[model samples]
Target: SHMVGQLSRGAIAAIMQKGDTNIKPILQVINIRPITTGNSPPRYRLLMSDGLNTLSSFMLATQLNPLVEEEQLSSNCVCQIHRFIVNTLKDGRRVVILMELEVLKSAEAVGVKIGNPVPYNE
Candidate 1:
């Protein structure tokens, strides 16, 4: 079941500006989206790329939040609007941020293999 936690608590999670580590109060931890099929489900659509199109998780996350997503209209927009997913490990803050990146230099840039996904139980 999904539990709508209190947004008034927890350490501040910021959306830093690209190329700049400055913490911006764009997407705070309090503004996290609850699970669709949870105890307190919030009805809203997520920002994701249709597919085959290249987009970043940052773009997708921001787009889901219209207030900030609408504000992004610059030439340096690197956020990809793809069906984003984040899985935080139970023992740590290790989250897998999945998104497609523009492969500028194919021969030089190799992808990083994080790990294989766990199989689902039938």
Candidate 2:
């Protein structure tokens, strides 16, 4: 299972602390950093966006704090930086992606908004 290889609590939480620093370390046993082929591999980063929303009640039981109406969650989702032969969407499209260390615990904290500007090609 892919989840079996997830980073440990200490490592995952590291994202919460050094989130501001570049090359942030996520404590994993193997493959901690994204694999870069040529220059740099694609990466997704979390940022504060302008907006507020409620969490889903059903997701509450899974969080550290479920009672709160609104809690801080990640703004960015997984984004891949690679040239694909086939056209496809970027990984950072979802607001609540559970894979790759993204998750929420309740409706009250389920859905949030990201105000980052679209990366439209000019």
Candidate 3:
């Protein structure tokens, strides 16, 4: 299932800092946790890295949990953001909501964090 050279690879900073272009970034999953509220279905909040900066504002849709439920989205797994939508919260903060994903490398293959990634503040 490791489709190395099949999909386009991208950077997290480029995706977020590219204005409103809606670019899809190929990022490594550093960490993921379940977020629950009220009676809504559980969603996942994940930390993604591009070997430079880490983006913590990304969310995995509830329907996309099959990847996580199957343990395919473990730490160090490489994933491509197939599609996404950016939304601005009331506080003027922007968030990148992942609409689609494609796994490129398994967690075991990567095995460790790639770079000294600092939190993405921009």
| Highest TM-score model number | 3
Task: Give candidates' CA RMSD values in order.
Answer: 16.0, 17.1, 3.7
Q: Estimate, for each residue in 1-122, the C-alpha lDDT of model 1 and write its tens digit.
A: 11112111111222211222232111111112323556642333222211112112232232244433343322222222223344445674423232322212121121221122121111
lDDT of 2 by residue, 1-122 (tens): 23222212232222233332222222211111222346543332223211221111011112322212232333222222111111123753222211222232222332322322222111
TM-score of 1: 0.20
Candidate closest to the true structure, highest lDDT: 3
RMSD in Å for candidate 2, one decimal?
17.1
lDDT digits (tens) for residues 1-122 of candidate 3: 34333223336666666754456567889899987767887788898887677888888877788989899888899888788877779998777778799888899988877756778886
Q: Score residue 86 of candidate 2 by CA lDDT.
A: 17
Q: Once model 1 is optimally superposed onto the true structure by TM-score, how far is the C-alpha of residue 115 displaced, in angstroms?
A: 25
Mark the 10 consecutive residues where model 2 has the least summed lDDT: 52-61
Worst 10 residues of 1 by lDDT: 1-10
Work out the TM-score per prediction: 0.20, 0.17, 0.84
* Greater-TM-score candidate between 2 and 3: 3
Q: Which whole-number lDDT from 0 to 100 does residue 106 have in model 1?
A: 22
